[PDB]
Structure 1
Amino acid sequence: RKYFVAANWKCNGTLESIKSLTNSFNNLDFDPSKLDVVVFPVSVHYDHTRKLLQSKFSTGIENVSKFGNGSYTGEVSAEIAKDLNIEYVIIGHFERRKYFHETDEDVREKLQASLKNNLKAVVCFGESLEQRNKTIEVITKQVKAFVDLIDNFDNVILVYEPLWAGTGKTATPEQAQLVHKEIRKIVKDTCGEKQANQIRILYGGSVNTENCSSLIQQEDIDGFLVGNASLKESFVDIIKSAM
């Protein structure tokens, strides 16, 4: 199973900061055929980001439209992503679910549009503080909402976002692992044992240079969707933890 370290820059950065950050990223020697390394910048920063990054770094977009091409203002369709050579998209990130009101129905439709247009999909999900001893219940409902559409278990990457860890609570690798194995059990029951063992499951909580080793060494944790720490040059040490 190939490891998958993803940087989600969210709504952050300038031309100068990307030039500085991508140059620091470039300096790390790693084998792209042994380790997947993906950076997700802002839509309007994509062209700039793709130019500055070396080809060992994969790239993608932080969202994709639930519709196709046509009269859908302010949206990026999966066709346009495929035409521009965009390899990855993120779908169902907690901030889109929370602020922009993306439902499990929208995540499914976004996944269908991505896979039909030969895009790889980083699919996010996870439970709140109040919900955590209902964790398995919630994650089962979220995974099953899209999981049957997965046509290739190398091109779809699951992300566990513990929303229970802007609350004050801190998640341990042990708590991550327990959920991770249950996510893989959900894939086993729905899509089969062979396909549950193919798929990458990322940890999309608070990841930094100190906790990534203890996390990535866990059995069912296959990489990260890293937020704030990926805006630092020290993001290379999080990539190093998966080498």
Structure 2
Amino acid sequence: RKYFVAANWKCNGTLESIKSLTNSFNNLDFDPSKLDVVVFPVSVHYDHTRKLLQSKFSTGIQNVSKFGEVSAEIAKDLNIEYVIIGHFERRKFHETDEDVREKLQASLKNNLKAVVCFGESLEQRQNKTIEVITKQVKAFVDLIDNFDNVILVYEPLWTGKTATPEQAQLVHKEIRKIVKDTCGEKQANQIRILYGGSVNTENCSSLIQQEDIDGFLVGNASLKESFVDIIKSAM
């Protein structure tokens, strides 16, 4: 299964900053049949970003409507390949597990690929981690039609605490067993589970080495040149 590294630029960038940053990304020699690399710019930067990045990179948008909203139909029509669903920022705009299920159903009926985010809070980590994550995942997992095309992301919302690569691997493990339980062992073995906590050039190798971590959804470190080194950890 293909490792997958994603740049979530969140609400950042200017037309010049994107030219320079996409240029440095372009400089990276990687094989896209080996490794998926996905850039998620702000909506109004999408066409600019998609033009500038080479075809070896995929692109997506950071949210999609279950119905100011970008509909899945509109994304389909523009050849926009990926959408992010359920990012904790969106949940903390009050997005619920039901909204996440319903966005995924909308995206999948339109031939979109989805990067779906979940994970447990500090308080829930009352030893409620597998419970919280089993509920979050069961809320949408039955919708998955092709297990190459839905990418899960564990976001350790649990603050002044840091997650170790061991603690990440343990939650990945249990997500892939939730999937195995709920959908089958071959499905679980197919699905990419990315780490979506704090990822930088210094801890990325320790995480990608982990048996159940297949890449990353990267926030602030993906606004820098050196994001190419996070990609290189996955090469």
Pair in the same fold by TM > 0.5:
yes
Q: Deviations over 1:118-159 (max 9, x none)?
A: 000000000111111110010000000000000000000000
- Stretches of structure 1 that go unaligned for 5 or more consecutive residues are 68-73
TM-score (norm 1): 0.96
Offset at residue 45 of structure 1 (A) = 0.4
Identity %: 100
In 2: Cα distance, 1:209 partner to 1:82 partner:
34
In 2: Cα distance, 1:171 partner to 1:16 partner:
35
In 2: Cα distance, 1:33 partner to 1:104 partner:
33
Offset at residue 75 of structure 1 (A) = 0.7
Residue 116 (structure 1) aligned to one of 90, 109, 117: 109
Q: Deviations over 1:1-56 (max 9, x none)?
A: 11000000000011111011000100000001100000000000000000000000
Other-structure match for 1:195: 187
In 1: Cα distance, 2:170 partner to 2:87 partner:
21
In 1: Cα distance, 2:213 partner to 2:76 partner:
29
Offset at residue 235 of structure 1 (A) = 0.1
Q: Deviations over 1:50-102 (max 9, x none)?
A: 000000000000000010xxxxxx1100011011000000000000000x000
Offset at residue 168 of structure 1 (A) = 0.4
- Stretches of structure 2 that go unaligned for 5 or more consecutive residues are none
Residue 140 (structure 2) aligned to one of 137, 142, 146: 146
In 2: Cα distance, 1:90 partner to 1:196 partner:
20
- SS in structure 2 at match of 1:85: coil
Offset at residue 201 of structure 1 (A) = 0.1
In 2: Cα distance, 1:142 partner to 1:108 partner:
9
Offset at residue 109 of structure 1 (A) = 0.4
Pairs aligned (count): 234
In 1: Cα distance, 2:141 partner to 2:215 partner:
20
In 2: Cα distance, 1:198 partner to 1:112 partner:
20
In 2: Cα distance, 1:187 partner to 1:241 partner:
26
- SS in structure 2 at match of 1:113: helix
In 2: Cα distance, 1:214 partner to 1:93 partner:
23
In 2: Cα distance, 1:195 partner to 1:229 partner:
31
In 1: Cα distance, 2:46 partner to 2:144 partner:
26
Pairing of 1:63-102 with structure 2 (within 5 A): 63-67=63-67, 74-98=68-92, 100-102=93-95
Offset at residue 108 of structure 1 (A) = 0.4
Offset at residue 181 of structure 1 (A) = 0.3
In 1: Cα distance, 2:26 partner to 2:12 partner:
20
In 2: Cα distance, 1:152 partner to 1:128 partner:
29
* C-alpha RMSD of the superposition: 0.4
In 2: Cα distance, 1:84 partner to 1:225 partner:
23
In 2: Cα distance, 1:191 partner to 1:225 partner:
24
